[PDB]
Structure formats: structure tokens, C-alpha cells
Amino acid sequence: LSPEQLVLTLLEAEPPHVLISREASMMMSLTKLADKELVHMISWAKKIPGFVELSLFDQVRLLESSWMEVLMMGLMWRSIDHPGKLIFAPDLVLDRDEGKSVEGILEIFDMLLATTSRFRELKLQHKEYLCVKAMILLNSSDSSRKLAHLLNAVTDALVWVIAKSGISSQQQSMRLANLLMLLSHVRHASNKGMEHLLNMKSKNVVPVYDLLLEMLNAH
């Protein structure tokens, strides 16, 4: 596939817009949304060319490792044009002040809002977002060589997207570095988010959502 056509495959893999149709209210809404998005995330991964040719063990390990980072990268893209807001979904738009209503959530909202602000300042483009979301999954913690091949293909596609912007080769290199460096801030926010959710699970204060539970228990 050309990089342009690999990026088109990522565009068609993009999950549909998810709505919740729904303190205790905020946390019920966030866990319900995460469970619904996890179903769509699995269909997305399977549409990444080569992913389903990986070992079932490698397909499971990659989604177990990266699911919270892939959720947070999606939230940042949705939030990019809405300063001060986290666009969880159309019916779940939250700000730092709604975060204060649950212990530990404010911290996570502040991290998500700050990283979103960094992507906003870089003017992150849709096709850059598609490449970095796939790289988050493929770069997470026969089959091994196929995975390095798939990760190289998606890296090549991001380099292509940046090249299409027509900025100097110098500016292309700096832009690639600045995007990839922000993913460590996504990974940090997901480490805090996972810690918080595990604590909420262990206290049984959030509903039994089977796929979410299974993906939490991986950690």
C-alpha cells in the first residue's frame, strides 16, 4: 500500500461517533462510555492492515496494554477545537470544574486538558491523529517481525502526512519529534487514569461492565 492508501485505511477503520444516552452520575457515565468505546476499539484494531495476521496472543497483549492511551488520544482529537472542555461524547462534555466533584479526577482532567492544549498549539491534523493513534496501539509494551513491519508502515505514513504539509525538511523533522514527544504525555495521563479506575473498581463504586472489567484486570 502507498502511505496515502494506508492512511485512507485508517480513516475507514475510525470508530463511529459514540453517545452515552445517560459525582456518582459522572463516574457511571465515564465507565459506560469506556465500555462502549472498547467494543468499537476492537473493530478498529482489526481494520488496521496486518493486525489480524498477528498471533491472537499479540493482538490481545497490544489491546490490553494500550486501550486507555487509545481512548485518551481519541478524547484529545475530539476536544482539540473546544478549549477548556473535554468532549468525552456529544452528551458528555465536561470541564475542570465538573472534575472537582470526584476525588482524583481533577488531576486527570488537568493533564488531559494540558496535553489537548499542546496538540491545539501544534495544530494537529486529522491524518496525523489517525497515524499516532495506530502507533500508540502498535508500539505498546513470525508475529514479532510482522508487528515491527506494521509499526514501520504506520511510521512511514505519518512521515508522509507531515511531508504533504510542504513545510521545510527541517520543520518536518521538528514536527515529527514534537508529535511523538506528546505521546509520552498521553501515556502519563493513561497511567494516572488506570490507577484511578483500578482504585474505583477495587472499592466497587463503578458498575460491572464485563469488557471494561476484563481490560482493567489485565493491569
Binding site: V39, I42, S43, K46, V52, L56, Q59, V60, L63, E64, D210, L211, L213, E214, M215
Partner: peptide
């Protein structure tokens, strides 16, 4: 609970 594997193998 093996919903991840179920979803990885069905469409």
C-alpha cells in the same frame, strides 16, 4: 469473561 477474544474472532 473472554469478550476481547470473542470480539477479535467474530464480525
Amino acid at each position: 469473561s473472554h469478550k476481547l477474544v470473542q470480539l477479535l474472532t467474530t464480525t
